[PDB]
Design a protein around this ligand. Structure first.
Ligand SMILES: *[C@@H]1O[C@H](CO)[C@@H](O[C@@H]2O[C@H](CO)[C@@H](O[C@@H]3O[C@H](CO)[C@@H](O)[C@H](O)[C@@H]3O)[C@H](O)[C@H]2NC(C)=O)[C@H](O)[C@H]1NC(C)=O
Length: 327
């Protein structure tokens, strides 16, 4: 059996195992990533969001994005580019702008053209629209929805196809794994893009899960079979699927019991990908717990990744690798 996650995915007939990355002076994560049998895809954690790429109108900021893209290209790794149209952390000039339908679209077009154009032939996937849905499956309120309406989603995909047809155009979102109204919303989005005669290549399930009930998420990672049916249901529309931001949080501190329970949760969701032909790959949201978004965003929650604060493999790493390698 293969001894690293990427090699295991390849041996099993999948495309990649990836991770989110922030380039920093601490070499702990990158030294693990350097192993070509371990990781084969990178998602820049922050360097390619709208604020990072165009913080002021017409003034692009390529340095960090170039640096993170180079981390993947210099190693011959795939790159998930993240993300174009997203409500969160929009620059003030976009979020608080005085827009009409036509002028906001011109702004979208200019941004999409410049960023997709620069990294064309490097971005394996693009998260074209991110987190466009409320928890009840209705459209999340943002400047894009207010000014352009529902049509902003297909228009974004039309602009993305024009700027770089060689990439895979993804819709990305969290909490789609549970087979509910939000899952249905993602399907509505995919249907809508296809209705315009446009291309949607994939649906990204972020997979920010829990292994036990937490204050922010009461429902722990569902059964392997349930997750497989959700994945296939999305694949039915004629798209690839992928787990894009996988982490599985618990109430801290961890104990051996909680670590094993967490490992079981990883086996279920990783297994669900193994079960579905159109599930192309898995990206975890970082290598080490040391730099995870979780404890800062939701204090009292954490221990969500495959390596601990000391860059040592947790029980979840072994359960993940074994699950990929199974039969
Ligand atoms: C802002 O302007 C855009 C055009 O620049 C408007 O987008 C248009 O929206 C309508 C729906 O309101 C789209 O119609 C749909 O077409 C598909 C298939 O072609 C069909 O399945 C639907 O039943 C519906 O008829 C239309 O295609 C779209 N036009 C373009 C060029 O994309 C948008 O409505 C404007 N927003 C506001 C708030 O006024």
């Amino acid at each position: 059996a293969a001894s690293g996650l990427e090699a295991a995915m390849k041996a099993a007939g999948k495309q990649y195992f990836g991770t989110a990355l922030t380039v920093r002076n601490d070499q702990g994560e990158i030294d693990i990533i350097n192993n070509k049998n371990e990781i084969g895809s990178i998602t820049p954690e922050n360097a390619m969001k709208w604020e990072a790429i165009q913080p002021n109108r017409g003034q692009f900021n390529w340095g960090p994005a170039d640096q993170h893209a180079a981390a993947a290209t210099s190693r011959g790794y795939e790159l998930r580019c993240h993300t174009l149209v997203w409500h969160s952390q929009l620059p003030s000039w976009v979020a608080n702008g005085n827009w009409n339908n036509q002028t906001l679209q011109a702004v979208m077009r200019d941004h999409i053209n410049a960023v997709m154009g620069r990294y064309r032939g490097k971005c394996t996937h693009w998260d074209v629209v991110n987190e466009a849905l409320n928890e009840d499956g209705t459209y999340r309120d943002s400047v894009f929805l207010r000014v352009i309406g529902e049509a902003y989603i297909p228009i974004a995909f039309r602009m993305a196809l024009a700027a770089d047809p060689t990439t895979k155009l993804y819709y990305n979102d969290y909490n789609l794994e549970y087979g509910n109204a939000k899952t249905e919303g993602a399907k509505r989005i995919a249907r809508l893009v296809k209705s315009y005669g446009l291309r949607i290549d994939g649906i990204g399930l972020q997979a920010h899960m829990t292994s036990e009930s937490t204050p922010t998420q009461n429902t722990p990672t569902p059964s392997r079979a349930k997750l497989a049916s959700v994945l296939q249901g999305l694949a039915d529309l004629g798209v690839d699927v992928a787990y894009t931001e996988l982490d599985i949080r618990m109430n801290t501190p961890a104990t051996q019991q909680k670590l094993q329970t967490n490992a079981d949760a990883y086996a279920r969701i990783v297994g669900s990908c193994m079960d579905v032909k159109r599930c192309v790959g898995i990206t975890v949201w970082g290598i080490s717990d040391k730099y995870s978004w979780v404890p800062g965003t939701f204090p009292g929650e954490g221990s969500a990744l495959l390596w601990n604060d000391n860059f040592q493999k947790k029980p979840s790493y072994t359960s993940t690798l074994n699950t990929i390698n199974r039969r």
